[PDB]
From a paper:
Since only far-red light is available at a deep layer of the colony, [name] has evolved a molecular system for photosystem II (PSII) excitation using far-red light with uphill energy transfer. Here, we purified a light-harvesting chlorophyll (Chl)-binding protein complex from [name] (Pc-frLHC) that excites PSII with far-red light and revealed its ring-shaped structure with undecameric 11-fold symmetry at 3.13 Å resolution. The primary structure suggests that Pc-frLHC evolved from LHCI rather than LHCII. The circular arrangement of the Pc-frLHC subunits is unique among eukaryote LHCs and forms unprecedented Chl pentamers at every subunit‒subunit interface near the excitation energy exit sites.
Author numbering:
A (entry chain B), B (entry chain A): 51 to 291
Write the structure that this text describes.
């Protein structure tokens, strides 16, 4: 595949070339630097379980095919979030009201709904069939009728390195996913929009924060703090095998 | 590097050439006199953990590179505090009000804020890239476009010794850091300014002290006394391996 790296390197980010930037840390055995965006992040070992790739079973190098399937899933989920962020910023910040009420103001019912759903699913099923059918011969799955989709050959055309685009794409998509999670959770606690929250925070950043919106802003903090205290205990327990 | 010493010596200060000036004290194994400002101060052994230097991994002398990275961090943090102390004394003691309200009286909002932030970050990212890129070939990181930055060669031009400037710089920076911590905590308990506290203490030094400002002056003393009683018990426990 061309979705895998060519140099097997770890980039030096905020603290080190690994999350958890202390000296008592050994990266997980199945993460060795072969895929873009590697940092050894796996507190719950979901890379050795959690999925079944569409490959012939009992073929050697099957445990690696599962990480490639999960990477395909990660890229696919990020490529939609990067489009959704642009599509919500270019609408909510141009003329329109809350972005979470636009679909409910189309008045789609009866026959048009049915024909739209059926046609969209026909197209997506035809594309998905080809994706599944591509992954199985070559360990890669391009979305638009081709296994690789490089209409303009730019996968190695960046003047700062060979495998630079591959590392940039998996990181922009990774940032956009939790960007959109932020939009979805912000719209439910504050009631305002994205820009209307940034400006409120920049105006006076000591009452226009999360801790001043009532019970929801406390419930989210509680959930976040409880989930963040479990994946660190899990990592500490993992380091003792 | 030229940030390390040439003579491997310990200077004799307030009590001895070590903190904890008693006879039952052996310096930590990783602190041996090779860096400026050495005193064997390490109750919590943060010099063998806590960080990952940007060097090629598995290269010999990796445990020493981490102390050099932490020394780089110490010098970097001190060089900003020494500028901030001068910048707050030359403003608060010249004409202006509380120094912790100046940024809030610039009225920076909208486009100017965004362009200023983006430009500053562009410049700092360009400089930081060069710093990270310098540390990795030579174990040193100068901030201003050069690995060493000696426009006027004065690193060995002091008429009291060879490595005198190196020991003076790490100590002035070390004093300025807790100087500024004092300014920040003083402004929150007293409400006055820096000079307005020194003059109040010199006027009548038995009611213009920390113990007479209410509950905050007691909370700070309590926190200080609780943190000071933990790093001595830790040192005593360390001395018994
Ligand atoms: C409350 C829980 C919690 C906390 C406190 C942290 C804290 C941290 N995480 Mg995170 N993390 C958490 C939950 C949490 N994590 C969860 C739930 C997940 C699952 C998704 C992760 C997954 C995760 C990963 C995968 C990584 C981290 C990393 C980090 C570090 C960088 C954070 C960062 O970029 O800040 C944002 C900060 C900035 C963009 C710049 C900071 C500058 C600000 C604006 C002010 C100046 C800086 C500051 C003053 C300097 C120190 C001063 C201070 C000591 C007084 C940091 C120690 C990274 C790390 O440690 O890499 C080595 C990392 O790779 N975390
Ligand atoms: C759905 C998106 C998705 C998927 C499929 C993956 C998949 C992968 N990531 Mg992860 N990752 C993602 C999003 C995703 N990532 C995001 C958004 C971040 C930013 C925090 C990261 C950051 C990250 C790092 C730093 C690293 C990986 C790595 C990996 C690989 C490790 C194996 C693994 O855990 O796979 C299984 C993963 C799943 C099956 C997804 C499980 C989703 C859970 C169950 C839902 C949790 C939802 C909850 C609301 C989260 C709240 C977070 C918020 C509070 C902060 C794998 C290819 C490692 C690697 O080597 O990559 C090449 C690696 O070093 N990822
Ligand atoms: C917090 C939000 C969130 C999170 C955490 C995820 C996480 C995930 N999505 Mg995504 N997704 C989201 C929002 C989110 N999604 C939204 C808003 C949309 C709208 C378009 C989608 C639509 C979507 C689709 C259509 C699909 C995913 C899939 C996935 C999974 C892909 C990883 C993989 O291949 O492992 C595969 C892991 C398994 C097969 C283990 C199954 C265990 C179950 C599912 C536990 C739950 C991953 C768990 C893919 C998937 O396979 O989901 C299961 C998938 O088909 N997502
Ligand atoms: C997947 C994300 C997503 C989703 C679900 C929607 C959904 C919607 N958008 Mg769209 N939109 C998106 C992304 C998205 N948008 C993007 C990326 C942009 C920036 C160009 C916009 C800009 C935009 C505007 C300006 C408006 C909408 C509006 C709408 C609504 C009516 C449909 C319409 O007029 O579309 C029009 C959308 C477009 C002309 C751009 C579509 C871009 C597609 C989805 C990106 C993917 C293209 C694909 C990969 C190309 C394949 C090429 C290959 C075969 C070679 C609808 C709820 C209208 C609205 O808000 O009504 C109230 C409206 O005025 N959108
Ligand atoms: C993706 C990045 C992102 C950004 C830039 C912001 C920005 C903001 N959020 Mg947060 N937010 C995010 C994700 C993000 N959010 C996520 C993932 C969640 C779900 C847990 C929320 C849920 C949330 C709520 C419920 C509220 C905010 C609010 C705010 C504002 C005040 C800060 C605060 O209270 O943070 C709180 C942050 C958290 C609870 C969790 C940390 C969020 C991520 C993981 C930190 C990422 C750090 C990273 C270095 C930032 C990059 C910035 C980017 C420009 C490069 C501010 C505009 C408040 C607001 O609107 O005030 C007006 C508010 O009420 N956010
Ligand atoms: C409440 C807790 C506490 C106390 C009582 C002390 C006490 C001491 N520390 Mg400190 N220390 C503490 C917490 C504390 N430390 C903490 C939290 C840290 C972490 C940052 C350290 C880290 C630390 C280090 C790294 C070092 C010390 C050192 C010292 C000694 C010198 C202090 C000094 O310069 O005073 C200031 C005094 C003067 C500048 C001059 C004194 C003159 C005054 C004005 C009056 C006259 C002197 C006096 C009357 C003479 C004795 C008389 C008396 C017996 C009646 C002293 C025994 C040093 C040491 O022992 O070196 C051998 C040393 O190197 N400490
Ligand atoms: C951020 C600044 C900073 C940093 C990075 C370092 C780094 C270092 N110092 Mg330390 N040092 C500092 C400030 C700093 N120092 C200050 C301000 C003082 C004066 C009290 C000293 C005094 C001192 C001595 C006397 C010695 C060192 C030495 C060392 C080395 C020991 C290894 C170590 O612990 O590193 C790791 C350190 C860190 C990761 C910083 C941790 C910061 C903690 C977690 C925060 C505590 C904040 C809290 C509010 C403090 C309140 C104090 C107040 C109540 C008095 C290392 C290079 C030894 C050496 O050989 O130097 C060459 C040595 O002998 N330092
Ligand atoms: C009490 C105040 C205080 C203290 C104790 C520290 C302490 C520290 N600062 Mg500094 N800093 C301060 C105020 C303070 N800062 C202020 C006011 C500013 C404004 C400019 C900054 C901005 C600043 C930046 C931008 C950075 C630091 C960094 C650091 C760390 C450098 C040591 C190192 O390289 O180890 C490295 C140690 C680790 C990677 C271990 C991570 C463990 C986490 C961070 C525990 C917390 C050190 C812990 C640097 C750093 O790396 O921070 C983590 C860093 O990038 N500081
Ligand atoms: C890092 C510390 C720091 C910070 C954050 C600030 C911040 C500020 N200062 Mg400045 N200031 C500083 C240090 C600092 N100062 C120093 C060191 C001095 C002594 C010369 C002053 C003296 C000073 C005065 C007299 C005034 C301010 C004022 C201000 C405010 C408006 C900006 C301005 O007019 O700057 C003007 C600042 C300068 C002309 C001096 C800047 C010195 C820089 C920061 C030192 C570093 C230089 C750099 C290393 C050189 C690189 C060379 C290399 C390429 C070869 C602003 C909040 C104004 C104010 O209070 O308005 C209400 C104001 O009147 N400052
Ligand atoms: C927890 C854990 C354990 C470890 O072992 C490893 C690990 C990495 C798994 C780790 C963490 C995993 C994490 C944090 C994963 C997070 C995944 C996340 C947050 C994924 C988010 C995906 C979001 C997506 C697709 C969003 C799609 C949004 C769309 C929106 C569509 C819109 C709608 C509805 C109408 C609007 O008018 C217009 C528009 C906004 C476009 C649709 O266009």
């Amino acid at each position: 595949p061309t979705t895998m790296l060519e140099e097997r390197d770890n980039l030096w980010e905020i603290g080190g070339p690994y999350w958890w930037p202390f000296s008592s840390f050994t990266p997980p055995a199945h993460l060795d630097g072969s895929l873009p965006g590697d940092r050894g992040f796996d507190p719950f070992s979901l890379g050795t379980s959690w999925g079944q790739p569409p490959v012939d079973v009992s073929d050697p190098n099957y445990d690696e095919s599962r990480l490639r399937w999960l990477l395909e899933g990660e890229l696919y989920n990020g490529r939609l979030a990067m489009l959704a962020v642009v599509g919500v910023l270019t609408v909510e910040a141009q003329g329109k009201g809350p972005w979470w009420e636009i679909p409910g103001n189309l008045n789609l019912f009866g026959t048009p709904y049915v024909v739209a759903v059926v046609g969209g699913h026909l197209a997506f099923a035809l594309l998905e069939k080809k994706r599944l059918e591509n992954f199985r011969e070559t360990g890669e799955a391009g979305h638009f009728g081709a296994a690789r989709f490089d209409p303009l050959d730019l996968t190695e055309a960046n003047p700062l390195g060979t495998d630079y685009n591959r590392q940039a794409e998996v990181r922009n998509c990774r940032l956009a996913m939790l960007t959109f999670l932020g939009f979805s959770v912000q719209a439910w606690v504050t009631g305002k929009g994205p820009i209307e929250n940034a400006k409120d925070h920049l105006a006076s950043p000591f009452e226009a924060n999360i801790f001043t919106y009532g019970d929801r802003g406390t419930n989210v903090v509680a959930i976040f703090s409880a989930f963040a205290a479990v994946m660190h205990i899990a990592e500490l327990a993992r380091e003792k095998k």
